[PDB]
Scaffold this motif. Structure first.
Motif, PDB file in Angstrom:
ATOM      1  N   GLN A  37       3.796  -8.743  13.500  1.00 16.29           N
ATOM      2  CA  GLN A  37       4.220  -8.044  12.288  1.00 16.29           C
ATOM      3  C   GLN A  37       3.372  -8.530  11.105  1.00 16.29           C
ATOM      4  OE1 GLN A  37       8.637  -7.801  11.706  1.00 16.29           O
ATOM      5  NE2 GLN A  37       8.169  -7.719   9.510  1.00 16.29           N
ATOM      6  N   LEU A  39      -0.356  -6.946   8.649  1.00 16.44           N
ATOM      7  CA  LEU A  39      -0.797  -5.963   7.651  1.00 16.44           C
ATOM      8  C   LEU A  39      -0.632  -4.519   8.132  1.00 16.44           C
ATOM      9  CD1 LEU A  39      -4.111  -7.871   6.897  1.00 16.44           C
ATOM     10  CD2 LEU A  39      -2.441  -7.523   5.067  1.00 16.44           C
ATOM     11  N   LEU A  40      -1.174  -4.228   9.316  1.00 17.03           N
ATOM     12  CA  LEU A  40      -1.146  -2.883   9.904  1.00 17.03           C
ATOM     13  C   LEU A  40      -0.825  -2.914  11.408  1.00 17.03           C
ATOM     14  CD1 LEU A  40      -4.779  -1.575  10.381  1.00 17.03           C
ATOM     15  CD2 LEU A  40      -4.438  -3.496   8.818  1.00 17.03           C
TER      16      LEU A  40
ATOM     17  N   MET B   8       5.892  11.617  -0.594  1.00 26.91           N
ATOM     18  CA  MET B   8       7.070  11.281   0.214  1.00 26.91           C
ATOM     19  C   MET B   8       6.881   9.975   0.985  1.00 26.91           C
ATOM     20  SD  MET B   8       7.741  15.164   1.590  1.00 26.91           S
ATOM     21  CE  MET B   8       8.963  14.842   2.861  1.00 26.91           C
ATOM     22  N   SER B  10       7.098   7.049   3.571  1.00 25.38           N
ATOM     23  CA  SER B  10       7.263   6.871   5.021  1.00 25.38           C
ATOM     24  C   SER B  10       8.012   5.571   5.304  1.00 25.38           C
ATOM     25  CB  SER B  10       5.909   6.869   5.731  1.00 25.38           C
ATOM     26  OG  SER B  10       5.154   8.023   5.400  1.00 25.38           O
ATOM     27  N   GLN B  12      10.006   2.437   7.808  1.00 22.46           N
ATOM     28  CA  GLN B  12      10.212   1.556   8.957  1.00 22.46           C
ATOM     29  C   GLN B  12      11.539   0.814   8.728  1.00 22.46           C
ATOM     30  OE1 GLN B  12       6.473  -0.780   9.571  1.00 22.46           O
ATOM     31  NE2 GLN B  12       5.461   1.172   9.114  1.00 22.46           N
ATOM     32  N   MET B  15      12.623  -3.332   9.171  1.00 23.18           N
ATOM     33  CA  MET B  15      11.924  -4.166   8.228  1.00 23.18           C
ATOM     34  C   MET B  15      12.667  -4.024   6.934  1.00 23.18           C
ATOM     35  SD  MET B  15       7.881  -3.251   8.808  1.00 23.18           S
ATOM     36  CE  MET B  15       7.396  -4.679   7.842  1.00 23.18           C
ATOM     37  N   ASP B  24       3.370  16.647   1.451  1.00 25.57           N
ATOM     38  CA  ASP B  24       4.061  17.589   2.348  1.00 25.57           C
ATOM     39  C   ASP B  24       3.266  18.865   2.637  1.00 25.57           C
ATOM     40  OD1 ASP B  24       5.651  17.786  -0.535  1.00 25.57           O
ATOM     41  OD2 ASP B  24       5.327  19.771   0.347  1.00 25.57           O
ATOM     42  N   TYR B  25       3.214  19.259   3.913  1.00 27.87           N
ATOM     43  CA  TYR B  25       2.379  20.388   4.359  1.00 27.87           C
ATOM     44  C   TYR B  25       3.021  21.391   5.326  1.00 27.87           C
ATOM     45  CZ  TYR B  25      -1.601  18.787   1.653  1.00 27.87           C
ATOM     46  OH  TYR B  25      -2.439  18.437   0.621  1.00 27.87           O
ATOM     47  N   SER B  26       3.888  20.903   6.214  1.00 32.90           N
ATOM     48  CA  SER B  26       4.534  21.746   7.235  1.00 32.90           C
ATOM     49  C   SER B  26       5.649  22.657   6.683  1.00 32.90           C
ATOM     50  CB  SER B  26       5.045  20.887   8.403  1.00 32.90           C
ATOM     51  OG  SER B  26       6.203  20.157   8.044  1.00 32.90           O
ATOM     52  N   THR B  27       5.791  22.679   5.355  1.00 29.95           N
ATOM     53  CA  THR B  27       6.684  23.600   4.636  1.00 29.95           C
ATOM     54  C   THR B  27       6.022  24.094   3.332  1.00 29.95           C
ATOM     55  OG1 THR B  27       8.451  22.092   5.420  1.00 29.95           O
ATOM     56  CG2 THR B  27       9.152  24.055   4.215  1.00 29.95           C
ATOM     57  N   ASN B 164      -0.943   1.542   5.514  1.00 25.71           N
ATOM     58  CA  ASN B 164      -1.723   0.414   6.039  1.00 25.71           C
ATOM     59  C   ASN B 164      -1.934  -0.621   4.926  1.00 25.71           C
ATOM     60  OD1 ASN B 164      -2.346   1.691   8.754  1.00 25.71           O
ATOM     61  ND2 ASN B 164      -3.428   3.150   7.429  1.00 25.71           N
ATOM     62  N   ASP B 166      -0.019  -4.277   2.825  1.00 25.58           N
ATOM     63  CA  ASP B 166       0.959  -5.328   2.533  1.00 25.58           C
ATOM     64  C   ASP B 166       0.782  -5.834   1.101  1.00 25.58           C
ATOM     65  OD1 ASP B 166       1.628  -5.151   5.379  1.00 25.58           O
ATOM     66  OD2 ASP B 166       2.368  -7.207   5.220  1.00 25.58           O
ATOM     67  N   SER B 171      -6.338  -3.719   1.180  1.00 23.00           N
ATOM     68  CA  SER B 171      -7.257  -3.498   2.305  1.00 23.00           C
ATOM     69  C   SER B 171      -6.806  -4.232   3.570  1.00 23.00           C
ATOM     70  CB  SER B 171      -8.695  -3.896   1.924  1.00 23.00           C
ATOM     71  OG  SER B 171      -9.046  -3.394   0.644  1.00 23.00           O
TER      72      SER B 171
ATOM     73  N   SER C  16       4.184  10.016  10.787  1.00 21.17           N
ATOM     74  CA  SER C  16       4.778  10.416   9.510  1.00 21.17           C
ATOM     75  C   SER C  16       4.093  11.652   8.929  1.00 21.17           C
ATOM     76  CB  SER C  16       4.745   9.256   8.511  1.00 21.17           C
ATOM     77  OG  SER C  16       3.419   8.819   8.273  1.00 21.17           O
ATOM     78  N   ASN C  18       5.395  15.934   7.039  1.00 23.91           N
ATOM     79  CA  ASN C  18       6.409  16.724   6.348  1.00 23.91           C
ATOM     80  C   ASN C  18       7.471  17.243   7.308  1.00 23.91           C
ATOM     81  OD1 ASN C  18       6.712  20.053   5.212  1.00 23.91           O
ATOM     82  ND2 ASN C  18       7.719  18.322   4.200  1.00 23.91           N
TER      83      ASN C  18
END
Lengths: 50, 171, 50
Positions: A37, A39-40, B8, B10, B12, B15, B24-27, B164, B166, B171, C16, C18
């Motif tokens: 767990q 950075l990526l 929007m 995303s 997890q 955590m 957003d694109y699929s709507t 990607n 923290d 980077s 991830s 829409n």
């Protein structure tokens, strides 16, 4: 006596469990592992082929 | 600069912290401009929605400081219910020493009545720390818009915006 | 999503994105031989006119 010979070097692993830490530092310490767990590495689903 | 989508976040779950925001694109509706009599509507209906998601962002949560903090204290994120319910015992603490070892075996109490109860708190021993536990995600980071994409190259940009990413280093 | 003979393990790989309009899920089965992955006029896969 003298009969020329060459040594074979096979090893034997018994009951031992193939252990490996999931770390860049290669250390098995804590539940939240060093590279488990990071950075990526908690990243989304990517394809795995070994 | 003129037509961007509301970003929007995303997620997890275990955590607790969100990864980063995405468009957003699929709507997302057709941008093939219908004509001069509907171009002001497709840019206008969206414009008031941009203020719908802007106003609630300051209401639902306090304005952004640390955009994604893992080391997170509880203030708006709620610590679970602190209320205990304490009940008495059918048998007493000191009215039992007289009988069993002497001769009379034992098998409000209808022998010698007493009233003694002690109540102790139910609350989480020390305050909530780390990510969001159960369900407080929407109330913590509401979908919010940066209407001028990357306006300002070297100083600062949308930083914790990237999945990607923290908080320690870019980077 | 094409799947081979005598296999039982296949999931969907989408991260991830829409989702703002959704009534739910639907699924059925179909052969690769009778109809292919459409989008073309006459692609190198047709051979079952059933």
């Amino acid at each position: 006596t003298a009969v020329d010979s060459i040594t074979q070097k096979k090893f034997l692993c018994d009951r031992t469990l193939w252990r490996i830490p999931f770390s860049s530092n290669f250390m098995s310490m804590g539940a939240l592992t060093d590279l488990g767990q990071n950075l990526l590495y908690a990243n989304s689903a990517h394809a795995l082929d070994m | 600069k003129e037509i961007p989508t509301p970003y929007m976040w995303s997620y997890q779950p275990q955590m607790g912290l969100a990864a980063g925001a995405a468009q957003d694109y699929s709507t997302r509706i057709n941008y093939m401009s219908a004509g001069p009599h509907m171009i002001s509507r497709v840019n206008g209906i969206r414009a008031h929605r941009n203020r719908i998601l802007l106003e609630q962002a300051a209401i639902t949560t306090t304005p952004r400081n640390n955009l994604n903090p893992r080391s997170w204290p509880a203030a708006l994120v709620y610590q679970e219910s602190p209320a205990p319910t304490t009940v008495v015992l059918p048998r007493d603490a000191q009215a039992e020493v007289q009988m069993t070892n002497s001769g009379a075996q034992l098998a409000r109490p209808s022998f010698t009545p007493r009233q003694a109860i002690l109540t102790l708190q139910t609350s989480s021993s020390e305050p909530r720390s780390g990510g969001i536990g159960t369900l407080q995600f929407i109330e913590e980071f509401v979908p919010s818009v940066y209407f001028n994409p990357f306006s300002g190259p070297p100083g600062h940009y949308p930083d914790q915006f990237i999945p990607n990413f923290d908080a320690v280093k870019d980077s | 999503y094409p799947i081979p003979a005598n296999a039982t393990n296949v999931p969907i790989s989408i991260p991830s994105r829409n989702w703002a309009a959704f009534r739910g899920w639907a699924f059925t089965r179909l052969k690769t031989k009778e109809t292919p992955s459409l989008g073309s006029g006459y692609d190198p896969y047709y051979t079952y006119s059933g």
